[PDB]
Copies of this chain bind each other. A is one copy, B any other.
């Protein structure tokens, strides 16, 4: 006889307050990416990024995160 009770309780908070957010300047000089290759052989669950240039501005009013995993294996 096996009895398993799984009842975690979560009443947590992840929060923020901000009066004013601003005057943000993202102005990098432009750059160069040069990639030289001959043969590309990609097999079986392969993930790739080749030859990439990017500029990202991310300014959320709050970007709080809560990540939660629950796993029960019997």
Contacts and interface: CB of A to CB of B under 8 A. Distances in A.
Interface of A: 1-74
Contacts of A24: 22-26, 57, 59
24 contacts: A3-B4, A4-B72, A8-B8, A8-B9, A15-B16, A20-B20, A24-B24, A25-B26, A26-B27, A26-B55, A33-B33, A38-B38, A39-B39, A41-B42, A42-B43, A46-B47, A48-B49, A48-B50, A49-B52, A56-B58, A57-B59, A60-B63, A62-B64, A65-B67
| Copies of this chain in its oligomeric complex | 10
Contacts of A30: 28-32
Given A18-B21, A30-B32, A36-B37, 14 more contacts: A1-B2, A9-B9, A11-B19, A16-B16, A16-B17, A17-B62, A26-B55, A44-B45, A52-B54, A53-B53, A59-B60, A61-B63, A65-B66, A69-B71
